[PDB]
Symmetry: C7
Subunit: 140 residues, 7 copies
Amino acid sequence: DNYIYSTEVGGVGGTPFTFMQESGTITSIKFNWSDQYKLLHHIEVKFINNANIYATGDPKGNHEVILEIDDDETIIGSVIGYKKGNDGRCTGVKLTTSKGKSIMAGYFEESLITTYTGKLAGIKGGAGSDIDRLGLIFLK
Amino acid sequence: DNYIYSTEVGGVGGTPFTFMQESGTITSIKFNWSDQYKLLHHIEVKFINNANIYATGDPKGNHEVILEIDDDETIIGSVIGYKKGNDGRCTGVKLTTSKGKSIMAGYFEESLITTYTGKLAGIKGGAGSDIDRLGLIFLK
Amino acid sequence: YIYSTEVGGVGGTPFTFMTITSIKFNWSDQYKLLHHIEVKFINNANIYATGDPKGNHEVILEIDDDETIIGSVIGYKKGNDGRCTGVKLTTSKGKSIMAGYFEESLITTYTGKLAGIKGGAGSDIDRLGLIFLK
Amino acid sequence: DNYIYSTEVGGVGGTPFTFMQESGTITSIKFNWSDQYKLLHHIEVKFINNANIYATGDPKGNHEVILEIDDDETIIGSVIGYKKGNDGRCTGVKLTTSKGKSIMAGYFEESLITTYTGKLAGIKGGAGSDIDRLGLIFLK
Amino acid sequence: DNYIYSTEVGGVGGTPFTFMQESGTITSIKFNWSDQYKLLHHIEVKFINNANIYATGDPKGNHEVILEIDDDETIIGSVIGYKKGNDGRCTGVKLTTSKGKSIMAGYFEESLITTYTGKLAGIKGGAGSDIDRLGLIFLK
Amino acid sequence: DNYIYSTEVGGVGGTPFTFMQESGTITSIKFNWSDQYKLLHHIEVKFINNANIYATGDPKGNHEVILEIDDDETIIGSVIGYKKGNDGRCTGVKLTTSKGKSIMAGYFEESLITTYTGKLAGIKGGAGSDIDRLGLIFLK
Amino acid sequence: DNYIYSTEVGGVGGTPFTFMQESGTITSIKFNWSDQYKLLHHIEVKFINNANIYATGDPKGNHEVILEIDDDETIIGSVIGYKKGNDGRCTGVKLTTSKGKSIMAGYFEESLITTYTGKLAGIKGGAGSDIDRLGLIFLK
Ligand SMILES: OC[C@H]1O[C@H](O)[C@@H](O)[C@@H](O)[C@@H]1O
Ligand SMILES: OC[C@H]1O[C@H](O)[C@@H](O)[C@@H](O)[C@@H]1O
Ligand SMILES: OC[C@H]1O[C@H](O)[C@@H](O)[C@@H](O)[C@@H]1O
Ligand SMILES: OC[C@H]1O[C@H](O)[C@@H](O)[C@@H](O)[C@@H]1O
Ligand SMILES: OC[C@H]1O[C@H](O)[C@@H](O)[C@@H](O)[C@@H]1O
Ligand SMILES: OC[C@H]1O[C@H](O)[C@@H](O)[C@@H](O)[C@@H]1O
Ligand SMILES: OC[C@H]1O[C@H](O)[C@@H](O)[C@@H](O)[C@@H]1O
């Protein structure tokens, strides 16, 4: 692999997903969460040179945030909130970029992971009603 | 295209508008918003070498701000506040320039996007009584 | 010359003063408005004035021969019946002034070497535009 | 030796561990702590080019944090909070790194050590129910 | 003329003073003010290579500040608070230097000038009971 | 000498101590203090290339902090709290290193010394139940 | 002279003192003050290559602070608080060095001088019960 796989965090629940393109980096990512469940529920990704929107999980959240990533822009700082355990859930995401851009999504009330950094390339995990589990993917 | 199209955020309502000029960059942009609705209602854009004011939406807000951009000034930080959904609306905007100029219009109470950065070339979206949706447009 | 947007109303008497070595703003707490502006140019002892100096406050910014505006905010009320309400300026040498009120509308202007001002004034400063060198 | 052994702090209790790979550095670290006991309880570590999770302690706390360390990333700031004496215990860890990443696990109510700095290579200590005692280990 | 004369601010009152020495700079300047009147009352100046004190005004204030200037240190920040009009007065002075030294004397409740900057050469104005009027003078 | 002796501060009481090793710098130092007396009570030092722990004063405090010092790490900031007088006492110690590490032991309610700075080489003073007196020793 | 005499501030009272040594710089200075009188009472100075303490004033204060000055360390910021007048007194001293060291002694309620800066070489003034009057001395 020409990739780094960050630890998938959260539960074993929902349907597996893996978004990646052969010579392709993420150009846009969207987080949808609720104040009712304090969870992530829905994620969309767009890729470079590809108009196609790749979605997973049920967009039942009252908030969304999108981060748009320039062609030369990397993730230097990355934090996923989650609930640990087999019945676990991904609850939150902060990201910060080589250009001072940041996004903050959902809640960080239990467990965290400060992931690897670099050019964000894909995401992997499991999602149904909620984002059960999420790991980021980078280049080397 | 030599253009970067940021995600149009907000609703599908209102009349579509596209402001862009062959070989031209925005030299002035105005945002008009109300405390009453917590929405953007009206945008004006001037372009380099062109005394024409392209306007959209009903200018019924009690506040407006204008950002004038020098020929060599770029947007380095960009956040649009909006209400997601078909029945959506663009609620606020926050720009910061390569010269430390910044403006802030409206409210950021629901969803946000941190857009692409670069030399702002124009805008597109939909507007009637309100700015239903707004996407920014940069040079490569 | 770069001409920044004149912001405020259509009222009062047109003025055009045209490097600025000195600019003074006069405003009041009663009306929360700019009433009067005075300007001196380099190599000229003449004081150019507009608007009625009725206000209880004034500030002066003196500008060194090599000192530019890098930060510029004019506060105003919008519309035909508009007024200029305030001015913040910040220079390339870290100097800054703060005049009047910023309670409704703002413009962040073009930056550079301040060369003049245009607008209209009577009792008040109805409308103000900064002018810079290219 | 090609290594630096930071002082093991805390008590004499629990079962000995020593996790270190010759010619290998710690790529991931997880701290599991409780709000009930105000203690670290469990630690997992993964080395580079090795999916095997080397774990010690009982994972019975309500919180966990995970730091993923990039191949060229070093620890520039390191604080373990502990209770001193024979019946002593490890109670917290704050790690700050050469890229600005930071994790804060546990509580710092009694005693602190600001360790040696560099490339985190391994951990040594004793653990049962609780992390009784922890010492970081770096390269030279 | 090798000199910049900053605008004299304040009133027409008091006895004229003008303190300056050809090829001489201010090595020290003292401001005396009162909480009673909220006015500057007295000013003193020493010049480089000269023990003599050039004074103006009635030293009746409950406070004074002295700023000593090294031979190569200039003024980069200078603000005089004053009451405008013919019956006007000087109320305050903030000065900051090229070495990060600063003094603050009296009050700033009505009018300010942010003056010219550079090597402080002398002072000019009128003073009796109070400082009616003050303009600074710098080298080119 | 090739050493810098910081002022010993505190009282004349206790048993004199000197902890220095020819060709060796302190690689570790531990402060033990109490909330009961608001004094430093006990101090331990380890030296580069030496596993021997040098100790003085009675370890009766409820808090201890340890600072580990990389071989190339100096002290850039040093404050000792103490009571003045013959019957005086050393009450706390704050050290900041050339790598941004810092510690804070005991109390600063009475007198303080901002010491000399450099590579910390030893310590000296007197101790019994308390640290009566502490002086730091640096290389030139 | 190869010396800069900062203004002596405070009163005419007390016994004159002058601390200076020919090719010498202040290596240690102590300031004794009281919360009772809000005055400096006592001052001690040690010089480079000289174990002798030069003292002035009456040590009646409940507070003291000591600054040690490395041989290549200068004063870059200096403030003396004082009561002006014939019956004036020196009330306080703030010093900041070329290495980020700083000390605060006594009180700043009335008058201040921001002195000349450079390598502190002595002090001059008068003292009895109190420090009546204090002026610093630098090298050129
Ligand atoms: O995402 C939460 C939840 O979503 C659905 O309810 C199912 O897919 C579950 O298996 C899953 O755990
Ligand atoms: O701007 C909000 C709203 O304004 C008008 O009522 C119409 O143009 C709608 O389409 C639009 O959605
Ligand atoms: O300045 C406000 C107001 O003042 C004067 O009355 C006139 O010059 C008007 O034209 C103007 O609108
Ligand atoms: O880890 C805390 C505690 O847990 C277990 O009971 C044993 O390992 C003890 O030796 C240990 O002290
Ligand atoms: O300073 C206020 C007042 O002081 C003195 O009385 C005189 O010099 C007046 O001319 C002056 O106006
Ligand atoms: O250390 C504080 C105090 O403790 C012991 O009682 C003795 O050694 C005393 O001399 C000492 O002053
Ligand atoms: O120092 C304060 C005070 O102490 C003594 O009384 C004498 O030295 C006085 O002249 C002096 O003013």
